[PDB]
């Protein structure tokens, strides 16, 4: 009994991780392979949605720093024109007590009341003294924060903010994921800034938002090796006889499997009780992505802002961005005409006539868990009110468009129990020739950015084919702390082979 299709390497999922595996498989051009996804549009959670009124919203952020030349090579290939990209300056602010405090927070306590500055400085002094004598390392995220910042800064920012982000207490999280850097505060730089009173770029696609990158990357692949859409939905994986079954009944035989779906779904699709049980020990939070389109020129108070962080309790979201700042093509042009749905204060607008722009746009994120639930019916309104309370929207601003989507698997949580589970789950799948990789494929946030995830797929294939170490998967500190320039979209294998076929 033979499957409808047979390939050496099967890739499940066409998010960044799956596309990475596909790109390196395509480059190597050795073993046979194919990639499937239930979504007709590749990009997974790094896709970009659009509102009926033409406002774009990324559902999974954007890369700010690439750690790898290989990732760069693929983006350059996908979007090879200078005008394909806008290049912006890396910046950030924290919203604290009516102030926009620049990153890094501790280096700008100067902008807080003098009383708060005292509590913060006393906190770092204590922490700096203890660190001088420390002979152990922190065991929880919380301990890490305190040793690093002092109780002062920890209570102002780190603690409350991180709870808003992870939907889980900082006491319930590990810290290893943060890196090897010794937990020791830079007291001198902090006080120096307090006394003096004083206080890097990234590219973003011009059109299509982040999702446009992955569409263009996928378009470089040989179309007949892709199966995207309902015809590409996987319904079961038979690990014992290495066969996958799709929704439409198609069967696929594989020798090695690279699975980028959530590892808990994989265990279900495998009907593996042991893996399902191990898999349930993992924790994750859901996230709500909220989009707000509004009429008007970009407000003075807002400027060239990007990520904004919100520790305080006058708004449910933990971060927001002025998405309209990243690219003029993220929202409709001025000439386009749209009706006002409501004002920022939640009341009916004066006129309901479709009017001109220009427009700007805000995007934000709310976290959710069994330890921090959210009312889905009221969350949109609360967020908008939150934009008011934080002085991002005037109560008079006119809202032209709203976007609200909830993602069940939003963040894989770095809980104290994560590694105990992963060190069992991953090797067990490995023994079955299954490479489970990705944000939820391998569940490691420290390597959960688009560039990391992409490379997790690239390296899994490199392990399958060339016996390479999976460095990003098992040594995040090693890859994050170096320049990764060795692996290129064009390696010696292809140069030599191409040159050979030329004089032959």
- Annotation: binding site for FAD: 17, 37, 45, 60, 62, 234, 319, 439, 448-450, 453
422 token code pair? 């992963």
How far is Cα 230 from Cα 38, in angstroms, rounded to an integer? 5
How far is Cα 168 from Cα 162, in angstroms, rounded to an integer? 8
Decide if residue 500 touches its own copies (CB under 8 A).
Answer: yes
Decide if residue 50 touches its own copies (CB under 8 A).
Answer: no
- HSE, CB side, 13 Å, CA atoms: give it for residue 191: 12
Q: Which stretch binds its own copies (CB under 8 A): 47-55, 125-133, 296-304, 440-448?
A: 125-133
19 token code pair? 């596309």
* Subset of residues 177 to 196 that bind its own copies, contact rule: CB under 8 A: 187-188, 191-192, 194-196
For the CB of residue 479, give the shortest distance to its own copies in the complex, in Å.
10
Decide if residue 163 touches Cl ion (CB under 5 A).
Answer: yes
Using CA atoms in the order 418, 174, 405, 386, what is the torsion angle rounded to 10 degrees?
160
Handedness of CA 390, 394, 395, 399 (dihedral sign): negative
164 token code pair? 């808003």
For the CB of residue 108, give the shortest distance to Cl ion in the complex, in Å.
8
By a kind-dependent CB cut-off of 5 to 8 A, residue 249 interacts, out of its own copies, Cl ion, none, with none
As a whole number of Å, the end-to-end CA separation of the chain is: 42
For the CB of residue 185, give the shortest distance to its own copies in the complex, in Å.
11
Rounded CA Rg of the chain: 24
Residue whose C-alpha is closest to residue 21's, from 5, 6, 37? 37
Strands 307-309 and 234-238: unpaired
By a kind-dependent CB cut-off of 5 to 8 A, residue 32 interacts, out of its own copies, Cl ion, none, with its own copies
Decide if residue 125 touches its own copies (CB under 8 A).
Answer: yes
Decide if residue 471 touches its own copies (CB under 8 A).
Answer: yes
Decide if residue 107 touches its own copies (CB under 8 A).
Answer: no
How far is Cα 171 from Cα 200, in angstroms, rounded to an integer? 33
By a kind-dependent CB cut-off of 5 to 8 A, residue 484 interacts, out of Cl ion, its own copies, none, with its own copies
Decide if residue 463 touches its own copies (CB under 8 A).
Answer: yes
* Residue number, 133 or 200, with CB nearest to its own copies: 133
How far is Cα 59 from Cα 79, in angstroms, rounded to an integer? 20
DSSP per residue over 298-347, as a string?
A: PPTTTTT--EEE--SSSSS-SEEE-GGGT-GGGS--TT--B---EETTSS
* Residue number, 446 or 491, with CB nearest to its own copies: 491
294 Cβ neighbours under 8 A, 6+ residues apart? 344, 359, 360, 361, 362, 393, 397, 398, 399, 400
Site string for Cl ion, 99-138 (x = CB under 5 A): ----xxx---------------------------------
How far is Cα 460 from Cα 474, in angstroms, rounded to an integer? 12
For the CB of residue 104, give the shortest distance to Cl ion in the complex, in Å.
4
| CB-based contact 66:178 (threshold 8 Å) | no
For the CB of residue 468, give the shortest distance to Cl ion in the complex, in Å.
35
**From 31, 61, 102, 169, residue interacting with Cl ion (rule: CB under 5 A):** 169
Binding residues are 17, 37, 45, 60-62, 67, 90, 92, 103, 106, 158, 161-162, 166, 181, 234, 307, 309, 319, 411, 439, 445, 448-450, 452-453
For the CB of residue 442, give the shortest distance to its own copies in the complex, in Å.
16
Residues that bind Cl ion (CB under 5 A): 103-105, 159, 163, 169-170
Contacts to its own copies by CB under 8 A:
8, 28, 30-32, 70, 114, 117-118, 121-122, 125, 128-129, 132-133, 135, 187-188, 191-192, 194-197, 255-256, 462-471, 475, 478, 484, 486-488, 491-493, 496-497, 499-500
């Amino acid at each position: 009994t033979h499957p409808d299709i047979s390939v050496d390497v099967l890739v499940i999922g066409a998010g960044p991780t799956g596309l990475g595996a596909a790109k390196r498989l395509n480059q190597i051009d050795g073993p046979s392979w194919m990639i499937v996804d239930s979504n007709e549009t590749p990009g997974g959670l790094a896709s970009t949605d659009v509102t009926p009124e033409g406002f774009l919203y990324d559902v999974g952020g954007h890369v700010i720093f690439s750690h790898y030349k290989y990732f760069d090579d693929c983006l350059d290939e996908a979007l090879p024109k200078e005008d394909d990209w806008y290049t912006h300056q890396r910046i950030s602010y924290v919203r604290c007590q009516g102030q926009w405090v620049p990153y890094p927070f501790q280096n700008n306590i100067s902008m807080l009341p003098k009383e708060e500055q005292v509590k913060c400085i006393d906190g770092m002094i204590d922490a700096a003294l203890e660190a001088r004598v420390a002979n152990t390392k922190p065991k929880t995220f919380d301990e890490w924060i305190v040793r690093m910042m002092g109780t002062g800064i920890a209570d102002l920012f780190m603690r409350p903010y991180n709870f808003k982000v992870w939907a889980v207490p900082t006491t319930k999280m590990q810290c290893a994921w943060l890196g090897e850097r010794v937990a020791a505060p830079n007291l001198k730089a902090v006080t120096t800034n307090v006394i003096l009173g004083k206080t890097a770029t990234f590219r973003f696609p011009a059109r299509g938002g982040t999702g446009g990158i992955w569409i263009a990357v996928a378009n470089t692949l040989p179309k007949e090796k892709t199966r995207f859409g309902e015809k590409g939905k996987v319904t079961k994986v038979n690990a014992n006889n290495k066969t996958v079954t799709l929704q439409d009944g198609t069967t696929i035989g594989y020798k090695k499997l690279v699975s980028t779906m959530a590892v808990d779904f994989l265990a279900e699709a495998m009907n593996d009780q042991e893996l399902v049980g191990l898999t349930k020990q993992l924790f994750y939070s859901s996230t709500h992505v909220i989009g707000v389109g509004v009429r008007g020129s970009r407000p003075e108070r807002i400027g060239d802002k990007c990520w904004l962080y919100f520790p305080e309790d006058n708004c449910p979201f933990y971060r927001a961005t002025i998405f309209s700042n990243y690219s003029p093509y993220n929202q409709p042009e001025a000439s386009k005409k749209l009706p006002t749905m409501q004002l920022a204060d939640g009341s009916r607008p004066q006129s309901t006539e479709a009017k001109e722009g220009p427009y700007w746009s805000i995007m934000l994120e709310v976290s959710e868990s069994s330890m921090k639930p959210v009312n889905q019916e009221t969350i949109l309104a609360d967020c908008i009110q939150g934009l008011v309370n934080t002085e991002m929207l005037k109560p008079t601003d006119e809202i032209v468009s709203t976007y609200h989507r909830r993602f069940d698997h939003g963040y894989p949580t770095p809980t104290l129990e994560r590694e105990g589970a992963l060190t069992q789950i991953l090797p067990k799948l490995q023994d079955k020739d299954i490479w489970s990789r990705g944000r939820f494929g391998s569940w490691r946030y420290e390597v959960g950015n688009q560039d990391h995830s992409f490379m997790l797929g690239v390296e899994a294939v490199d392990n399958i084919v060339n016996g390479a170490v999976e460095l990003t998967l098992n040594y995040p500190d090693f890859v994050n702390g170096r320049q990764n320039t060795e692996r290129r979209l064009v390696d010696g294998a292809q140069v030599f082979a191409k040159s050979k076929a030329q004089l032959e």
